[PDB]
Amino acid sequence: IGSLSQVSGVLGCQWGDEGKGKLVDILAQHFDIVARCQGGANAGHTIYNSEGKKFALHLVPSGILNEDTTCVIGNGVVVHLPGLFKEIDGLESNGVSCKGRILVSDRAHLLFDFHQEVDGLRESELAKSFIGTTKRGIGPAYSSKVIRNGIRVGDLRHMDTLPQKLDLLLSDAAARFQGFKYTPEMLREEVEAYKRYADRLEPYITDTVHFINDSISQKKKVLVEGGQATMLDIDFGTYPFVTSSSPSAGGICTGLGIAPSVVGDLIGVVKAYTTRVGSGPFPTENLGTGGDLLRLAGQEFGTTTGRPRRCGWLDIVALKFSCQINGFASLNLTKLDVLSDLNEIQLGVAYKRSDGTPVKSFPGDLRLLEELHVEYEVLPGWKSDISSVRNYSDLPKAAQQYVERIEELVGVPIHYIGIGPGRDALIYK
Amino acid sequence: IGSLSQVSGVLGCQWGDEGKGKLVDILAQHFDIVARCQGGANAGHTIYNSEGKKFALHLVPSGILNEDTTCVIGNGVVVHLPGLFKEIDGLESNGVSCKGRILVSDRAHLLFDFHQEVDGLRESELAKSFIGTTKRGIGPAYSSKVIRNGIRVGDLRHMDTLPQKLDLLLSDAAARFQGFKYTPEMLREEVEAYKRYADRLEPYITDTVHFINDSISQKKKVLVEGGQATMLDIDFGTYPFVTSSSPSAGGICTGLGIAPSVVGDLIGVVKAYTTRVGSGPFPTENLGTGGDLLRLAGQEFGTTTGRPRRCGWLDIVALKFSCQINGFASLNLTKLDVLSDLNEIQLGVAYKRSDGTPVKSFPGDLRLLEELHVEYEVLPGWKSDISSVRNYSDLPKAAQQYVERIEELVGVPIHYIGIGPGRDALIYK
Ligand SMILES: Nc1nc2c(ncn2[C@@H]2O[C@H](COP(=O)(O)OP(=O)(O)O)[C@@H](O)[C@H]2O)c(=O)[nH]1
Ligand SMILES: Nc1nc2c(ncn2[C@@H]2O[C@H](COP(=O)(O)OP(=O)(O)O)[C@@H](O)[C@H]2O)c(=O)[nH]1
């Protein structure tokens, strides 16, 4: 743990809910800075302190629980101020003092209220391939960024031109969707509202790129927190069933201003099995007993909705893919304890076409991904409670073998084994 | 030169026309693969072969002149098929055989004809300050990618659904801009057109991610080609006066599927001074005779338009910035020969606010970037022709000192010095 590189990172290997939050929180004990690089409020990093208090971070980096840690919100992120403050409010009321510990990049883009209303207006137009995003507005935010008419955090320091920028964004949104209720009164609404936010955010705004780099040359330890998993990447994911950001290792560079040569060891958080929140390709998805079971044992339900999340077996093909894309040094096999009630465990060892020809690497073509079939391997499951095991060799032999099997197949070793939602529930290897 | 890492790369440090094309063409001799990772057709890499023929690449990687080199168009790119073929056509008629040498990623997005018409509709609609783009539609291309409704290269293998995707994109475009002439006839137009493109492009389409990665473990040499310069990066540039892609080192990872730990030595192409094609923040801009002379000796005029480009002194503040963002190993100081007529050469050494407070690092705030003033340094120029100098020590002492000074202020060594547009006009150090 203390042998990690000066600039380490934590990324997701599957489809989003691996359990990075827990890891970052545990790792932040030996890191000066914890910085998020991509995504937005769409997250939901759940952590439990030393006592057992349930903290569900969204924008604020998971390392916010460590008092001697400076949290940085990078440039690749899309901050929604109303929500950011609300998160800070309820964070300080629960103990953690966020004063001068949350550095918000001035190059990061502002996700506005209209961005959220606009995202949803497009959902009622989608066919059977609708996204799972409940009007969050991540797409529209990055849309504006790329178009180059979006507003950034540093733009809040020029309240004179802010209403001018606002008009355009709102004009674009009104011209597009007829359902968008746009009035000259609503323009003045967010202008006054964001003015208060601008005054409030002021102390927070800082040059992230400069800070990170300066800190790095100052020998300060930096732990980058992966927004989501790579299979949700805008490029390497299961397009179009992905997020608009870059959960990949590249997003650390583009989202923080760090050179590739500066990025150190990356730990890929892999769940003992797999899950997927929205719709789309899922090769190892189980729609029966084992599926309903993994969901209950892992409590794989929406936190805000309670909607059942798709469950399946650890996809080895999809995992080797994420391993090469990010070049992970180590892996964090989470939710191992979920497999404690399994008689026999399965692994998605290979892909093969309808016709029989083996599939090379994880394909980008959604169709081929929904046509092919998986070749499983069955490992003997241990049937004993393990949420109390602290050492490695104390683990049931069947469990050890499962871990060791994933390593043999993937090539990347596992140094972290999660066996419970607890902060202390982690087996080092 | 042969000491370069297995996976090298060449990126731009200023605002676009540094001279990478020349360099990649020169470096391609010792590389098995040359791959573009970001941007689109907006490029204009000019190169001269052994004889003196002027080749102006756009989409095809600059290493296309080397017969034993397989060019790869990564996934971060936005290919406009009509233009790509037109380029391949006029390329093969000029000698170079592109058969089985241009590998087009299946995960790359397709820049459509409507994307170009749409892009131009937003500039004429806007009042006052524009962008200065030739209406190539790079922005809208990435817009759709982010929105996740954009069509990719691999989607051409499913002609049955292709017309469905088209309708959405065109619907989005028509709903937004009233000026967009959309008819059910123009839909079928591009459908039949792109069917032909699909059949023709078929041989080219390959899994870029897999190819690159597999090739790399096979010990094949890969030279990544930087689209443009980092000061034009969507994040680290001078927003909103930047491109929609990531010309940064990160773009190599997100645009190719290469892990940061895999990316080797990056070479930063720096002009002996600075230029800027469009409008926007340009600290070192010289509106006097100094810029006039600088422009003429450098031939800084649009190739397609003939428009005069903004000229200035080598910005050290902007250069150190790009150097930390990409973490360059070496630099390629280009167009040195342009300063051969200069009595004295200046360097933008520091930034200072209106009140006097020093501006730490390169700022993101465009306003601050247009308010601050630059503190220059004046070095004695050599007044001799050097376009024929082959060895380093053969260069006038004043020239050597200029080179060594840039290395002292920046911290990154210069191993390549350009003294002419020629293929052979490069001094190694
Ligand atoms: N049962 C169990 N829960 C775990 C384990 N590791 C983490 N968790 C919990 O699983 C949930 C996954 O974390 P979440 O915040 O949703 O994932 P994130 O996407 O990385 O933010 C959290 O409630 C964790 O405390 C484990 O080994 N077993
Ligand atoms: N005088 C002079 N011209 C150069 C030198 N290096 C490159 N050039 C010219 O300027 C161009 C530089 O940018 P260009 O190729 O248009 O695109 P890039 O890919 O952004 O470099 C070259 O193609 C040459 O014609 C140099 O050392 N001296």
Short mmCIF file of N, CA and C in Angstrom, two decimals, chain B residues 331 392 400 402-415 429:
data_model
loop_
_atom_site.label_atom_id
_atom_site.label_comp_id
_atom_site.label_asym_id
_atom_site.label_seq_id
_atom_site.Cartn_x
_atom_site.Cartn_y
_atom_site.Cartn_z
N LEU B 331 12.59 18.16 -27.84
CA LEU B 331 11.89 19.19 -28.60
C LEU B 331 12.46 19.29 -30.01
N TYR B 392 25.53 20.62 -36.04
CA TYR B 392 25.14 21.61 -35.04
C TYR B 392 26.20 22.69 -34.86
N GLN B 400 23.30 29.02 -31.91
CA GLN B 400 23.47 27.97 -30.91
C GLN B 400 22.95 28.47 -29.57
N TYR B 402 20.78 30.74 -28.93
CA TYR B 402 19.33 30.88 -28.93
C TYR B 402 18.73 29.54 -28.58
N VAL B 403 19.22 28.50 -29.23
CA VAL B 403 18.77 27.13 -29.00
C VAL B 403 18.97 26.71 -27.56
N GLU B 404 20.19 26.88 -27.08
CA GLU B 404 20.55 26.50 -25.72
C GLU B 404 19.80 27.30 -24.66
N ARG B 405 19.38 28.52 -25.01
CA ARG B 405 18.64 29.37 -24.09
C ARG B 405 17.23 28.85 -23.89
N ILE B 406 16.62 28.38 -24.97
CA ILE B 406 15.27 27.84 -24.90
C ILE B 406 15.30 26.59 -24.02
N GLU B 407 16.38 25.83 -24.10
CA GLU B 407 16.53 24.63 -23.29
C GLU B 407 16.71 25.00 -21.82
N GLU B 408 17.42 26.09 -21.56
CA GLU B 408 17.68 26.53 -20.19
C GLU B 408 16.41 27.01 -19.49
N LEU B 409 15.63 27.81 -20.20
CA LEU B 409 14.40 28.35 -19.65
C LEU B 409 13.30 27.30 -19.50
N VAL B 410 13.24 26.39 -20.47
CA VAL B 410 12.23 25.34 -20.49
C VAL B 410 12.57 24.09 -19.70
N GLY B 411 13.81 23.62 -19.81
CA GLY B 411 14.20 22.43 -19.09
C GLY B 411 14.18 21.15 -19.92
N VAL B 412 13.67 21.24 -21.15
CA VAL B 412 13.62 20.08 -22.04
C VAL B 412 14.64 20.32 -23.15
N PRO B 413 15.51 19.34 -23.42
CA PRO B 413 16.54 19.43 -24.46
C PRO B 413 16.01 19.38 -25.88
N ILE B 414 16.65 20.13 -26.77
CA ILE B 414 16.25 20.16 -28.17
C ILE B 414 17.17 19.25 -28.96
N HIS B 415 16.59 18.18 -29.52
CA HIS B 415 17.36 17.22 -30.30
C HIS B 415 17.17 17.37 -31.80
N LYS B 429 20.82 17.05 -32.69
CA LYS B 429 21.61 17.48 -31.53
C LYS B 429 21.48 16.46 -30.40
#
